[PDB]
Design an enzyme around this catalytic site. Sequence first.
Site, PDB file in Angstrom:
ATOM      1  N   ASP A   1      41.401  -1.989  30.674  1.00 42.18           N
ATOM      2  CA  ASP A   1      42.970  -1.671  31.423  1.00 42.18           C
ATOM      3  C   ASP A   1      43.934  -2.394  30.581  1.00 42.18           C
ATOM      4  O   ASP A   1      45.015  -2.117  30.550  1.00 42.18           O
ATOM      5  CB  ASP A   1      43.124  -2.207  32.806  1.00 42.18           C
TER       6      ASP A   1
ATOM      7  N   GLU B   1      44.494  -1.703  27.178  1.00 41.61           N
ATOM      8  CA  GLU B   1      44.067  -0.912  26.308  1.00 41.61           C
ATOM      9  C   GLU B   1      45.345  -0.345  25.131  1.00 41.61           C
ATOM     10  O   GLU B   1      44.928  -0.310  23.930  1.00 41.61           O
ATOM     11  CB  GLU B   1      43.455   0.550  26.831  1.00 41.61           C
TER      12      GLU B   1
ATOM     13  N   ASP C   1      46.534   6.601  31.903  1.00 39.87           N
ATOM     14  CA  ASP C   1      45.757   5.288  31.781  1.00 39.87           C
ATOM     15  C   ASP C   1      45.098   5.276  33.439  1.00 39.87           C
ATOM     16  O   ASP C   1      45.443   4.807  34.418  1.00 39.87           O
ATOM     17  CB  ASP C   1      46.566   4.336  31.590  1.00 39.87           C
TER      18      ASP C   1
ATOM     19  N   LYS D   1      41.778   1.288  37.684  1.00 36.94           N
ATOM     20  CA  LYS D   1      43.003   0.942  38.694  1.00 36.94           C
ATOM     21  C   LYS D   1      42.871   1.130  40.038  1.00 36.94           C
ATOM     22  O   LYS D   1      42.161   2.223  40.225  1.00 36.94           O
ATOM     23  CB  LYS D   1      44.225   1.605  37.906  1.00 36.94           C
TER      24      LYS D   1
ATOM     25  N   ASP E   1      52.506   6.277  30.717  1.00 37.67           N
ATOM     26  CA  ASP E   1      52.009   5.164  29.595  1.00 37.67           C
ATOM     27  C   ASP E   1      51.850   5.434  28.151  1.00 37.67           C
ATOM     28  O   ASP E   1      51.529   5.104  27.309  1.00 37.67           O
ATOM     29  CB  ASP E   1      50.507   4.961  30.182  1.00 37.67           C
TER      30      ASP E   1
ATOM     31  N   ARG F   1      47.573  -2.429  23.799  1.00 34.49           N
ATOM     32  CA  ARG F   1      47.306  -3.457  22.522  1.00 34.49           C
ATOM     33  C   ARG F   1      46.105  -3.152  21.891  1.00 34.49           C
ATOM     34  O   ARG F   1      46.047  -3.768  20.594  1.00 34.49           O
ATOM     35  CB  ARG F   1      47.306  -4.856  23.020  1.00 34.49           C
TER      36      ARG F   1
ATOM     37  N   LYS G   1      52.943   3.482  21.754  1.00 31.01           N
ATOM     38  CA  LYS G   1      51.999   3.615  22.318  1.00 31.01           C
ATOM     39  C   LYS G   1      51.891   4.820  23.263  1.00 31.01           C
ATOM     40  O   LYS G   1      52.585   5.133  24.072  1.00 31.01           O
ATOM     41  CB  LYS G   1      51.692   2.572  23.263  1.00 31.01           C
TER      42      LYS G   1
HETATM   43 MN   LIG Z   1      46.195  -0.190  30.888  1.00 29.06          MN
HETATM   44 ZN   LIG Z   2      48.303   1.190  29.365  1.00 25.30          ZN
END
Ligand SMILES: [Mn+2]
Ligand SMILES: [Zn+2]
Lengths: 497, 497, 497
Positions: free
Chosen positions: B349, B351, B272, B279, B290, B353, B267
């Site tokens: 959020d 995101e 993010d 957030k 992230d 996956r 990932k």
């Molecule tokens: Mn996220």
């Molecule tokens: Zn993330």
Amino acid sequence: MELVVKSVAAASVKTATLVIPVGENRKLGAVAKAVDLASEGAISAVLKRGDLAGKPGQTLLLQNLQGLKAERVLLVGSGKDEALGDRTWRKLVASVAGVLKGLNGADAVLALDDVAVNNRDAHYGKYRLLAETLLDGEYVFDRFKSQKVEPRALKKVTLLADKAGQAEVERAVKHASAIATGMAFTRDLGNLPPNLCHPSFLAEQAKELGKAHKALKVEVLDEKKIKDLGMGAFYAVGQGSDQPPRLIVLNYQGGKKADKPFVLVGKGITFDTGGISLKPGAGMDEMKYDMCGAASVFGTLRAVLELQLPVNLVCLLACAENMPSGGATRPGDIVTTMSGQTVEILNTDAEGRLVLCDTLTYAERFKPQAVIDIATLTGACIVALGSHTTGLMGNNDDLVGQLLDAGKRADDRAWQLPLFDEYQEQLDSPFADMGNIGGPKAGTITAGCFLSRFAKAYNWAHMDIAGTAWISGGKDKGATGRPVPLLTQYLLDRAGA
Amino acid sequence: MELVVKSVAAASVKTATLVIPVGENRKLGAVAKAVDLASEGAISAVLKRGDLAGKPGQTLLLQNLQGLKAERVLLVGSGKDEALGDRTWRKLVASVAGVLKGLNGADAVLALDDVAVNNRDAHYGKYRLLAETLLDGEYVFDRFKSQKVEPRALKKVTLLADKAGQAEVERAVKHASAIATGMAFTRDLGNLPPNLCHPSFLAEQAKELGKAHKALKVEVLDEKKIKDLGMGAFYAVGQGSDQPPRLIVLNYQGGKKADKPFVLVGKGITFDTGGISLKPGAGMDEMKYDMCGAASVFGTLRAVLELQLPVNLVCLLACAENMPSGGATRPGDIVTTMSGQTVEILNTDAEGRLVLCDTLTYAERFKPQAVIDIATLTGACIVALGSHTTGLMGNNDDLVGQLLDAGKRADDRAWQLPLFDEYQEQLDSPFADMGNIGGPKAGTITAGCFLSRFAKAYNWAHMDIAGTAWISGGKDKGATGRPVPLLTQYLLDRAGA
Amino acid sequence: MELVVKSVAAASVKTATLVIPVGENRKLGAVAKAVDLASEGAISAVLKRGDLAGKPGQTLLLQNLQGLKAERVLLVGSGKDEALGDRTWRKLVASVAGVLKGLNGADAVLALDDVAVNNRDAHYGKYRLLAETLLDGEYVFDRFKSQKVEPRALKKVTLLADKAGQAEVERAVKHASAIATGMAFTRDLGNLPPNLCHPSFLAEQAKELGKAHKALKVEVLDEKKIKDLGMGAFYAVGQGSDQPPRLIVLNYQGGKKADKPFVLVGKGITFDTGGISLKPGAGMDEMKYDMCGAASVFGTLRAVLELQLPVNLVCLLACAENMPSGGATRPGDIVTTMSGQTVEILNTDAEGRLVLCDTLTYAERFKPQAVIDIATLTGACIVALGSHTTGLMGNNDDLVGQLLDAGKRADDRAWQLPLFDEYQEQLDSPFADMGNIGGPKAGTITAGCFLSRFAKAYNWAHMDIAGTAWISGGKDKGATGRPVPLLTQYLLDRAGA
Ligand SMILES: [Mn+2]
Ligand SMILES: [Zn+2]
Ligand SMILES: [K+]
Ligand SMILES: [K+]
Ligand SMILES: [K+]
Ligand SMILES: [Mn+2]
Ligand SMILES: [Mn+2]
Ligand SMILES: [Zn+2]
Ligand SMILES: [Zn+2]
């Protein structure tokens, strides 16, 4: 509801409702084909019309057929020509039970011998699950409805097996009856509102139970005795309430006198406001289920009492009401535990572990071979393992291994979380031996870590049922009776039954 | 720092600093005892005065003692006379390295053979940990400082073992240096700020790496190509940013021609914000971390290249920047994934996956024997396992066990969480085949269930490193390089190296 | 720890450890050089290798050196050759003490004459800070720990000055000893947990103190006496709790019969839950520090008692526990204060000003020349001035100016905030004479404005120590001794000592 086992042909037996399985594409197994023939092909004739696809749990209900002795016949789908999974099996049974509950039938016969369940033997395993789902699905809690509910018709269900497996099916019926009865007591206690279901009320229930069984003596320790024993943590929790705390000891002697006992420790916070660290308002009503750990102990005992299992079992219920008031415990209070370790209470809503920790020290006097504590301990467990799987930790692998294996067989599963040492430092306090909280990370684990510091005299496992003990909403909002099936299964294993 | 192994006597070597361990008894093992004798008890003489209690990692530094060719002798505590746990052993090594870095010696020798580490052999495992901690401890990210650190004097370290264990201590340094080198790279990419470290930047990083290694070919698929392969989830994630998404392919052919490849999927969300499901502000700077999934794949790849491991390894890096804007994805958007399954994006959020599910589908073409996705996926995993243990889920028990086993030996642990079927239905959507979130219960697990739906074609596992990939605060704040040791160790096990 | 002053040569004295300073650039001042010259260049030889850079508080420990009478030599860095700031000077001292406290020696000699301290005298001011830092650094609060740290080896420290300086270094040590001793008492009271440290406990402590000192009369006014004097605001704060309020009077007659007394008023809220305006749970444990105003006065008293200053000092400790209950004060209550002014209690978490207002009225009967209240009054003050600087306000510019200067000379600084009239309208009530809060603006100030309405009969000043009284987190978490240094220094100034 009576449940019995008979070895006669399905077509032969007289009944309000006979139940048989049908597979996808109108496929009748041996038992179901015999019923078709005996009904002069009336069943296969209606199936030709396509109303029942045969998917697991699908039903088509017939009314009475020439050449049969059944007033009604219920076709239930059993899916493709394949073993069903646990979950699918149980849903098939509840769907059956669901049609029967709405019938004016005094009795029913389940002729489902042809359905195979995955990794389950055909007599014991299969029916353990069917019998438990069926008896537990009769549970009603209508006691505070002022409209007395319409009393049902169904009173008897007969299960048909072949001769060879009959004894094994009866063994499954006997066990599931025991577990089912233990779950109803658990659910009653859990659902009971906290204005009626307080520690003293729980004390009275244990005494009454003790007056009903010969091998069980009960001893109730009050607020003063809790304090005198030096249980500073237990006492701190309960002191803020007008309802004082109780430590209830239920001692069942069912094995030899020299057999080291098994000890069940259940968190009995009869209501949890959070205390001075007050919880938010939303959904606070569900905090009456914070004594579900103690409720699962009552239920497990009630099932073993029913089975007269050959073991020594000591139940310890740590009961208190967590309330705010002018004399409640403060965040920052430091207390002395029965063990002599000091604990800074940084959050008064981490109180389950406080009553539990003195009770674990108390359990030492019994010289147990195993001590399992059961608690609705952490919000973090719900995040971790949700609704379906019990959190499990312990200081002995074989013991956790045993409890894990019991859950898989009962279909009431746990899952192990680690108690690594790196987690211990999170409980560090500047002033006392430990704080009662470890912060926002690894909440289920640090609670486990807190308790393990008091369980060093014996083999110990800890079960966080915060997610598995009740359902928050919808139709089926309430206590579930978990984990009575697991603990009872574990005791059955221990008893070699 | 350059690391070598020699088998000469501690008392004998010419060096700026000689390091020996000392126990709590004020005990000395063979090596420290030989050193003491070569100084006619000068070392015992200082210990007698009692400044050094020998708790793990306490230090006493001495200068020139007669008999010895070492300018300095550093005494380090080894504790209560036991084998040390991993953590303790590592803290010992770090304390040594701490002292060493603050000296003006170009050089040091470690004479630590006497120390036992619990359940690890004295030559490979013992030194895998030492060599990793010491080299990873060298790390400095001072690139954005005006006052850059002026280099430390220490540029080489010699480890002493006996003649017989020399080849084995040497293989430990070899592997450990590869890993420590991979981690530094992962940590640089992690620590880089998100205005410099974006998907195009990581593309460039990967091309350079392609050019520099003979056995590695790199392909970069841009946003248009991502869109054209029908990756609806991946594209939806990156579309709101000015920095377009990238899918990076790093294909290392180190095994035979038709060896089934290992696939690592990272990932790579380089920032993010949460997107439209924005957030909160506090701590948001840490979302530059992230992309630590992708960074840990780079690092493991670097380690593999350095090691010339004989395996085919395909690395797929799913890179996007999650920005709010006038063209960003909405909550409630329905997209078509590369697999054909549709996903309702209920929360923007969640995101990671989304970029991962399309990449998992993309991994099918390589015909892999194992696909492992790595991702800083859920705050829930932090709730579940905190900062010490990586969460692990998969569709294959043996692969999962292999990864668990690799973690235990690498001292970089994971811990399995279940992917039971009852969790699946938390993703149901009335509109699409699934939603991308399942509510607040069992978040780490539901994210895994979401992902398993795109990995049915192969052996697959998933690592949630949200809690192990970085440190939030203190002067320790930054990327850790986890899980490069576990991934690397697994690949070594697969190479049987 | 015992601190003595000698005027002998550094090299000539027999000690477990001699402490000398070394500059950045290897630099040695006179005293360091004489040590070096006596050790015949050993020290300098070591320095030449470059291990010690000489940044402040860096250390290099040496062992026994031909030519010296010290068992060990501790070199400590003193940085660039300029005069040190207070903060840098106190850090150097604390590093030295941290080293000496892990050594097994009975004593140490500090030979730090050559270090200058910016704007401070080489004899009194320099050593006031050194001696305090070292004595207050000895502080441990371990009474709730089962496993304690065994007493330190270090029991005696000698300070070397030249003979012309000795009397003044001794006067610094003596003022600093009393101060440190007061701070220890303050920190003990602050760190004690609220279940033990309640208003009745503090009362008992005052009575014990009045027994031990001939010059002190103590008097304790209980709940009903508070009520009968007309203290409606004080009484309302305490009524919620099972632990009743106490107003503690401690009278020290050290001056002439006709010297107007100095009055010190302490906020003693032993635990603050906010009451009905309940505080959030997060970090509530810190509210045991809400009696630090009272603690700082107790500790100033002990220092004044130790030094036998020739002044009249009256301490007034306004003690209550702020708890929620069925009888607790409600927002909206209107009470009548001793002054006859009425107050609308709009928020029960603004309680400190309520106990203090009534107590300020009470202070009138002593005809004071100054009245200083000390309180952990507002979160607004931590937002205004951080951890480093106490908020100060008052109705007399000379008193304020005197407290400010005292804080500067003591290195326990305050900062004045304005009591402009414009702010007083924020306290208007449409029902009572005033409300107890004025909203989200100027929060430290409006509390100041509030109290000034009860302080018109004398010169008065108000110290808001919410940010300076304790440290929130990490392993220094705990009460600081502040502001005992400022208050003691103010009285030393007044006494001409
Ligand atoms: Mn996220
Ligand atoms: Zn993330
Ligand atoms: K209940
Ligand atoms: K980054
Ligand atoms: K206190
Ligand atoms: Mn709670
Ligand atoms: Mn308050
Ligand atoms: Zn609870
Ligand atoms: Zn307060």
